[model samples]
Target chain A: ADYIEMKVPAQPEYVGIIRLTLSGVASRMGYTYDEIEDLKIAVSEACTNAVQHAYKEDKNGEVSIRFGVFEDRLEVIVADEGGLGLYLMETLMDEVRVQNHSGVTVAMTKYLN
Target chain B: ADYIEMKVPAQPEYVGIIRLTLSGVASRMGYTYDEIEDLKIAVSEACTNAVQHAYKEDKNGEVSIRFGVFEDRLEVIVADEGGLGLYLMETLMDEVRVQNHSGVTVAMTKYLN
Candidate 1:
């Protein structure tokens, strides 16, 4: 499977567009509706975290989003130019990671032969 | 129309809190259950983008969310420091824009007619 990446402005309104793209990608990859919803939520959370920490008040910032599609799993990497605290980064990453892990594991077990 | 705004640390967990706040605002506006659900999802997506690109690796960052309530509609603005590209912004904004706009249009048409 190929990976798809998107670089978006650090804006609040753009998250929905990313979610829509993610939904299309995941759905085409045979993800269930619920799985797509989970992906949307997880991706949104990751992107929001990036927007929060990517730039200063006067400077511009960017968010890099890479989507890895596997036959059995989809991985999304959301990265920003580092400046926010380590704890905050870890916490945000951890939340999404846990949620994604659980959701993916359940989906795979339930759907895969 | 009345607007409710909040400033918060750009963190992933905080998105849930914001969603909760939006839910309350939407409900009090006499929004239907479906409308509340849509607002939750929309707010979640906006906050996620904020988390994605708001701060640098070391500096603390914040996301400002403003909710505009009208007798018939709710407008939400999610703002962050500028850094990402304008096209990217427009694309992301457009997706959520359509979903939100269409949803509200249908809702109002049905409720007010």
Candidate 2:
């Protein structure tokens, strides 16, 4: 098992940073271009959901994104003290779990062959 | 005197749609490549902030982004039921404004020359 965790401001440019990190991770795991793209899309939607809807009025916020590297799959978790992207996330990943707490925690898994 | 209003799920792919829409609008307004890129970056940050921080726990949400097209400037407003990205928006656009109401409202303006 292996992992990486990063906390970033929920800004647009930071979104790119997260994608870049995921790209490297997915590529290293031998995910094909199509699979890597799907993973990227899922994470982007989750992050967008957080960036656009996480904080209540006048509240400041940050998003923590974590990646869990396993032998057969990669688990990506984006936890925000806020939460959507249900439609797109569902379309992009193999499995997606959503738990609404302080904000929202989105856990998604993509399989690699 | 003219504008376009779109309401979209705070997802990653929709980010591309908005960027495409904006590119068309900016080019029609006679903006250069550099200026168009700046506008896209500003909006992305604003929208990302909303997606990441606008809500608090289990709240169903969406993001409404509006473009105010003016002769001298293309004004972009990303309104959410939540907010942040003040730093990046500031750096990417000529003018950036954030307001907290029920959620958060971010307005950025890029001059077209």
Candidate 3:
């Protein structure tokens, strides 16, 4: 498996970049168009949740997103210093895991089936 | 400055992913449309060159790209275990620096003007 990690300022605008990368990886892995859209939504919700609650005002925080590309699945983990849209992420992805150890890590997976 | 790094497979397809991220960062940094286009071309050339000459057919090598986002400039460094489009990269970016010690590193910068 190949791993791609991106750490960006925890701002709403950078979310689009994450979405773009996700679409590209899913497309290259031969995921269906519908599947790609689902992945986008799931990942966006996770990233957005982090951006919104990860840090307080006057703080320059960052969100780290990691992509694990495997033969049959794409695993994405979005982590920030601090969650919402949990229902949307769970609905759009095959698997959704969350951890809250000071910082929050949302790991979502979508299999290419 | 904030730093973002991506390590991807040295494959032609992943080049588009790099370009998309570059465009996003440049846009967010207040680069004009023309400046953004220039950045895209320069970064794309460097990334493509690495993807083309970085590794052998059997070995799965990776290319590392690092971006330094600052108040007045964007610094990008694309490195691989290996040059073409040197002219294009030099022409489009404000500054272009290359290091060749076994592996090749193309470091480019574009100031927001």
Candidate 4:
């Protein structure tokens, strides 16, 4: 199993950065152009949610995304310390799970198929 | 033919709103989950580019998006009015056109393939 991690200011400017990261990771994982696009959208949605609803006050906050690579699938977990905001995650990935701890963590998984 | 329009502060916070709009429009357009995901990523990339490079003087600018709903396809034009910024637009959409006005306008079109 391989994992990639990135943390950026919880802002719209950073969502593009994460999408670019997803593009690279999906490419390395040998996804088709269409599959890569799927990954990018899913991650972008999660990051966008964090940027929109994560901070209660000051516009300054942080959103982190972790990618877990397995032989059968890929899992993307996004944390913004807001809540498990996976409102539309189920429509995009094969498996979507939400857990609340000190903050919100949403994990989305997609099969290699 | 039908169309939709939305404008928001040129901030990272607004991308999610646009993506949500896109999800609805694409769903109504009878796109598959995969196709809708593709549209979201393509539009997301264009909007992300605008949010990243469309402002210079103040970050408090505006990003406007127009959805051109066609009988056979969809076209999303994102105008940030900064400069003709379409650097990565080509790779995502079937057709991409750019023009410079007071700032920039990028027109991206996707066929109903």
Candidate 5:
């Protein structure tokens, strides 16, 4: 299949809206209800980490979330406004990375195979 | 003041259980409901990614999840059995990392200060 992507304000409340969208995508992919929930949680966490750690306290920022749908899996990318340390984000995202100074990109994949 | 850590079987069901634990910890640390939910979602995602991608299908695996309670935030670690590529896991957890071949660690922080 093709990939789906969206960008949102780095605000906390918007994370849930994003989660709902991810849930639908995962469910359509034939992921079980439980697996769908897991995907939602992962996406939320990635977004939450951006909300919590991405921007400075006074500066308003935005986080870009990208979703990749492959034949066998789903990928998610959460990019923040400023280039925070990938090492630190890695600590939160586990395998996530810092794409550049503009923001960070995190991807999630749910395998259908 | 201190960190809380735990280990469990790499199964989908347990992801929620871990999420509950994370919720409690984040709440106790004075995170708002929204923030707690965010943390829960993030941790669950990290764990689920491990369950789905960290090990082979034929082999039963274990995902090690650790929680670090800080004055300002909470940190999480989800380690898997095999040496899955960090790049792939990064796609899943967003801001997380694979510390070694055996597992990955993801952290979240709620600034209390």
Candidate 6:
């Protein structure tokens, strides 16, 4: 598996940057337009969840976005802190798993079909 | 300074992904079209240098691309293993600094003009 990891400030403005990065990754993996749209929304919501909930008004906080690229699917892990966004992301992707340790992780997988 | 860090497989294909991310960051910082083009070429060459020279045919190795976003400029550090590409990047950016420790780091900065 090829991996891509990005860490950005947990700010609203950086969301577009993350989505741009996601577009390049998804497109390189040969995802269709609709699939890419699904990915964009899912990722955008995940990042928003982190920015809104994770740091609690701390400007120094950071959000981590990771992509796991495989032969059959693309896996995204947005780690920070979430509610309706979780439900929306689950509906958009093939699998959605949430885990809480020191930080919250929402992992979504989308298969190429 | 706000920061964005990306670690990707040191492969030729992932170069486009890095460039896409750079575009978003540079554009958000209000860099003009010609400046963005200069950034694209400088960063492309930096990544190509890493893909060509780092890790010696090992697919598991990764290239780390970091963006330092500041009020006055955009600073990029492509830390890897360089030659004419190094000179070319210096010509394209405001300042270019190269250092060697465990690995080579080519740090370039382009001030907003």
Query: Which DockQ values do the candidates obtain, in the order shown?
Result: 0.02, 0.02, 0.01, 0.01, 0.05, 0.01
What does the lDDT read for residue B45 in candidate 4?
73
Model 3, residue pairs in steric clash: B82-B104
User: lDDT per residue, candidate 5, B1-113, as tens digits?
Assistant: 58677778888888888888888777778877876766666666667767876454645878777777766556677666222333333333334444443544544333443
Q: Residue B6, candidate 5: how far off, in angstroms?
A: 1.1
Question: Who is ahead in lDDT, 1 or 4?
Answer: 4
Return the lDDT, model 1, position A84: 32
Alpha-carbon error at A61 in model 1, in Å? Answer: 41
lDDT of 6 at A67: 95
CA lDDT, candidate 5, residue B43: 66
Q: Pick by DockQ: which candidate is best?
A: 5
Question: Which is the winner by DockQ between candidate 1 and candidate 6?
Answer: 1
> Can you write out model 6's per-residue Cα lDDT over B21-77, one digit (the tens) per residue?
999999999999999999999999888887886656564668899999999999999
Better of 5 and 6 by DockQ: 5
Question: Residue B58 deviation, candidate 1, in Å?
Answer: 5.5
Task: Assess the local accuracy of residue B86 in candidate 5 as a C-alpha lDDT between 0 and 100.
Answer: 35
* Model 6, docking class: incorrect
Rate residue A68 of model 6 by lDDT: 96
**Clashes per model (N, Cα, C within 3 A):** 34, 27, 1, 6, 32, 0
What stretches of model 5 exceed 4 Å from their correct place?
A: A1-96, A99-113, B54-56, B81-95, B98-100
Off by over 4 Å in 1: A1-113, B55-59, B81-113
What's the TM for model 1?
0.37
lDDT of candidate 6 over A1-113, digit per residue (tens): 99899999888999999999999999999999999989999999889987887557564678998999999999999986245565567567776666555356778889988
Per-residue lDDT of model 4, residues A1-113, tens digit only: 99899999987888999989888888888888888887887788778776776555556778878999889888899987222333334445665555444245678888787
Per-residue lDDT tens digits for candidate 3, residues A9-95, read: 888899999999999999999999999998898888888876777555545778899999999899999987212366566557766
Interface RMSD of each: 11.9, 13.6, 20.2, 16.3, 8.4, 20.6
The whole-model lDDT of each prediction reads 0.55, 0.76, 0.80, 0.73, 0.64, 0.82
lDDT of 3 at A80: 78
lDDT of 1 by residue, B9-104 (tens): 878879899888988887777877875776676566656655765444433667777787766567777665212322132222212221121111
